[PDB]
Each structure stands twice: as structure tokens, then as C-alpha cells.
Amino acid sequence: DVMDVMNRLILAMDLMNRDDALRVTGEVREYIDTVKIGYPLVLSEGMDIIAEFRKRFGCRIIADFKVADIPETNEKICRATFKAGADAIIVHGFPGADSVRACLNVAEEMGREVFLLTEMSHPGAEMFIQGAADEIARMGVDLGVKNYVGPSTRPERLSRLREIIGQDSFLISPGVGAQGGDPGETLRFADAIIVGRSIYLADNPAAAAAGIIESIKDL
Amino acid sequence: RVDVMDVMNRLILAMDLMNRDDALRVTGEVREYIDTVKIGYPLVLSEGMDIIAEFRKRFGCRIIADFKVADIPETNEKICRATFKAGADAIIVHGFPGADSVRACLNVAEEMGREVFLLTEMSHPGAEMFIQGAADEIARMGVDLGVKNYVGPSTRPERLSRLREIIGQDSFLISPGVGAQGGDPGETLRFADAIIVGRSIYLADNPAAAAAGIIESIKD
Ligand SMILES: O=C1CCN([C@@H]2O[C@H](COP(=O)(O)O)[C@@H](O)[C@H]2O)C(=O)N1
Ligand SMILES: O=C1CCN([C@@H]2O[C@H](COP(=O)(O)O)[C@@H](O)[C@H]2O)C(=O)N1
Ligand SMILES: [Cl-]
């Protein structure tokens, strides 16, 4: 019990225009109830865009801020993000145990959630992250982290993440569509998929999001 | 130094106060001593990206956005472009996500005529778990990518020394961890061109005196 993602599909709203972002999000609201908001939108439109998303859509907000500073600064960032109304925040694990714990404390203090990003989906992730991915995931377990983010681009790596974090841990996965990940094969190990450009750059975002779901209902 | 964009008194202020009035007031009190301000997410997320342009116009200071950019290439480019649009002169980027992620930041910086600082090793205890073991390689990856500006830990003088010899004498190196995190200004400035200082100054009873005192110990 962590999050009830409708149709197991999370929207990565990375449009950097408020009117564009609100419009495309509105066109897939009937298919998506959980929206991931990142720095491209927030830095272009302000942290207030989170509250405006909650008010206009009644959707759950995951702030993909990939927090990666020292513990003290991590706390300030998490505190500002939750204050702005984020339900959960995504946090890098590579800065180490004390940096993650700093976020975990603020999340508990404010009654919100932390997602631990263990391994990234892009090719450069092989240089440093992939070799540390297992130990970061394990670190998360030792810290009592219940929420994780893993690479859709690597189904075998995503499967290892699942057996590390356990069956009752909650797992979401970006890199579906644009980066090359397949929706179905990703949902074999992950609870929900994150899809960005395959929806918000399509001619019809509604049809795109519906097309993704219609190839998933078997799962 | 004139071969690179240097910093007045080798002192960079880390302005991590989270409300506009205090941030503006403290920075103004120490403006006579610095000309470079590092602005991070604590201030920006609380007061908006407009605060970068405001500081730049009000104080005539160079702005380094400590955003520790650490996403995929595509998203890195969007973040850097938005940051430079906000008027920042430089942006700090994580190296751990790999070469393609750093190159995406470098492209936007070169396009818009701004700078990238590569964060190689962090200054907190947790940095020893995964970052330290990769820091040497991140540093030489940076050199190979064309990166000329770096960030290294003041809390570990021996690691900072290793970093300097990897990047050579021509690269520009700045270092946080002085004061609150226990780093010494003197030993750090043996390797770094400039120190980043936050709480030691901005939480002091007299921030101006705090900044002046640090510069004095640097001066000799
Ligand atoms: O490893 C990671 C974590 C962050 N993300 C984030 O997930 C989102 C994916 O968007 P796309 O579906 O357009 O690839 C985007 O916001 C990106 O920054 C990754 O794609 N991979
Ligand atoms: O490794 C790092 C990079 C980020 N920084 C940043 O540098 C600043 C340090 O200021 P303090 O003097 O208050 O520790 C603060 O903004 C922090 O987030 C580090 O301290 N260490
Ligand atoms: Cl004074």
C-alpha cells in the first residue's frame, strides 16, 4: 500500500510551458491520475505549478527532483517541495546513506513519501551508476525505503531490483517509449510505468495514452 | 587569474537562506567582500527563478546555480536552458550520471555563452559510499569532455589535491565544506582557486564581520 496509480501509467509532464502542460495533462486525465512533475516545468513556471495541477486535476504529484546534495541541503529541498504540495519526491541514492536519510526524515516529518532512484535509464548510466545500482538498492532497504525507481531500458536490471527490494516494495520505471522501453515487459517487475515524450509529443496525447493502456489490459 | 573567470577574494557565498528578504539583506551586507554568489535550490524553490536575475542586477555579482544537474541528456538540456534563461552565469552538474549527461549540459552552455562546473566528489560523509570511488574517473572524464571548471571537497584536502593534479593547473576548481562542514580555508586554498562558504557567513550574528574575518585569514 503506497499509491494507486490508475492504469499503472504515470505521466512525465516535462513540457516547459504552462498552457501546453495543462492542456496535454487535461487530454489524458481520463487515463492518468498520477503526474510526475520535474525541473523543466517547475523552473519555467514556478513551484506554484504543483498546486495548480492538484487543483485543476485532483491528481497525485510526484516531484522528480532527483535530490542529490548534502544531508542539510537535501532537507531544505524536500521541505520546500512538500510545502509546495508534492505527494512524493524522487531522490538519488548515489550521494549515499546520510543524504537519503535526510530526505526520509523530512518525508516522515511532513507525512509524505520518498522514492529512491537506484539505476538510471540512459546509456551514460553504465559508466558509474549501473555498477553501484545493487548496493544502492540494498542501502535503500537498510534505510527502510519502500519506494523505488528503476530503468525500463534494462528489463534484466529492473528484475534484479525487484528481487532486492522485495515483492511489497513499490516500484516505478521511466524510459518507456522514447528511450526504447516496452510497456508490457516493464510492468512484469514494476508496479507502474512512467511515460513522457510518447504522450506529450504525440499528435494526439489522448490516443497515445489510450493506445499504451490498450496494450496493457492483458497484464 | 585572468585566463579564467576568477572570483573576488577567492570567496564564493553559498546563499541558502530560504526567504527573499533575509537572502537579499545578508548578501547585501557582504557584497563588498565577494562578487560571486552560489544560488541553489533552497532559495530558488522558495522564491522562484526570478531571484537569480534579481541578485545579478542588484549586486552586480556573477551567479552560479548549484542545481547539481543529474538527469538524462534530454532533461539536462531543458534544465540548463531554463537556468541560463534565468540569467545564471554558471551551473553545477553531477558527473556520476555519466558522460552523455555532462555533454548535454556543455552543449547548452557553449551555445548560450555560459559555464559548466563539474561536481566530481562531494564533501559530506555519505560521499564515501559511491562517489569517492568514482571521483577520479569523473574528473578525467570531465577533462576529456572539455570541462574547465570543477567542484571538489574541502573536507578532504588529500582528495582535493588528487583532484587538482588530475585536472591540471589550468582548470578552475572551487570547493565547499569550509566552516560548518569542518573544512579549513587555508588547506583548501592550497588546491582550490576559491572557497564556497555558506552557514559560517549567513548564519553568523554579523555576516559582514564573518566574511571579512575569513578574507583576512586568506589574505596572508
Ligand atoms: O533514469 C531516469 C530517471 C529520470 N527520468 C525522467 O523520466 C522522464 C522520462 O521521459 P520520457 O518518457 O520522454 O523518456 C523524464 O522526466 C526524465 O527526466 C528518466 O527518464 N530516466
Ligand atoms: O558536495 C557538495 C556540493 C554541494 N554543496 C553545497 O555547498 C554549500 C555549502 O555551504 P555550507 O558552508 O553552509 O556547508 C551548500 O549550498 C551545499 O548544498 C556542498 O556543500 N557539498
Ligand atoms: Cl563589516
Give the Cα separation of A158 and A153 in Å (integer): 9
- Tell me the nearest-neighbour CA distance from B49 into chain A, angstroms: 6
Of B16, B86, B97, the CB nearest to A125: B97
Cell of residue B95, nine digits: 558527473
Resolution rounded to one decimal, in angstroms: 2.3
**DSSP annotation string for chain A:** -----GGGEEEEE--S-HHHHHHHHHHTTTT--EEEEEHHHHHHH-THHHHHHHHHH--EEEEEEEE-S-HHHHHHHHHHHHHTT-SEEEEESTT-HHHHHHHHHHHHHHT-EEEEE-S-SSGGGGTTTTTTHHHHHHHHHHHT--EEE--TT-HHHHHHHHHHH-SSSEEEE--BSTTSB-HHHHTTT-SEEEE-HHHHTSS-HHHHHHHHHTTTTT-
Contact between A80 and A111 (Cβ < 8 Å): no
Ligand 2 interacting residues, C-beta cut-off 6 A: A 69-70, 73; B 14, 16, 40, 66, 119, 122-123, 176-177, 179-181, 196-200
Contacting residues of B for A91, CB less than 8 Å apart: none
Contact between A100 and A143 (Cβ < 8 Å): yes
Report the CATH fold assignment for A1-219.
Answer: TIM Barrel (3.20.20)
Nearest to A88 by CA among A103, A68, A73: A103
Please tell me the experimental approach by which this structure was elucidated.
X-ray
Annotated binding site for substrate: which residue ranges of B? 16, 38, 66-75, 123, 176-186, 198-199
> β-strand B11-15 against B36-40: which pairing, if any?
parallel
Burial of residue B199 (CB within 10 Å: 0-12, 13-18, 19+) is middle
Looking at chain B, list the stretches that DSSP marks H as alpha helix, in order from N- to C-terminal side: 20-29, 41-47, 50-59, 73-85, 99-112, 132-145, 157-167, 185-188, 199-202, 207-219
Of A80, A93, A121, the CB nearest to B42: A80
Q: How far is CA B50 from CA A40, A83, B105, in A?
A: 15, 19, 21
Report the CATH fold assignment for B1-220.
Answer: TIM Barrel (3.20.20)
Give the environment of ion ligand 3: residues with CB less than 5 A.
B 208
Contact between A81 and B45 (Cβ < 8 Å): yes
- Tell me the nearest-neighbour CA distance from B135 into chain A, angstroms: 10
Number of residues that make up chain A: 219
> Which atom of ligand 2 sits closest to the CA of residue B122?
1
Contacts of B62 (CB under 8 A, 6+ apart): B5, B7, B35, B36, B37, B56, B89, B90
Shortest-distance Cα residue to atom 10 of ligand 1? A196
Q: What are phi and psi of A127, to 5 degrees?
A: -60, -50
Put simply, the answer to whether B44 touches A43 (Cβ < 8 Å) is yes
DSSP reduced 3-state for B220: coil
Give the Cα separation of B148 and B171 in Å (integer): 5
Q: How far is CA A156 from CA A52, A92, A193, B8, in A?
A: 38, 21, 16, 51
Which A residues in the span 39-58 are in contact with B, Cβ-Cβ below 8 Å? 39-40, 42-44, 46-47
Contacting residues of B for A43, CB less than 8 Å apart: 44, 49, 79, 82-83, 86
- Tell me the nearest-neighbour CA distance from B53 into chain A, angstroms: 13
Q: Which residue is closest to B78 within chain A, CA to CA?
A: A40
Pocket test for ligand 1, best of B72, B79, B81, B96 (most atoms within 8 A of CB): B72
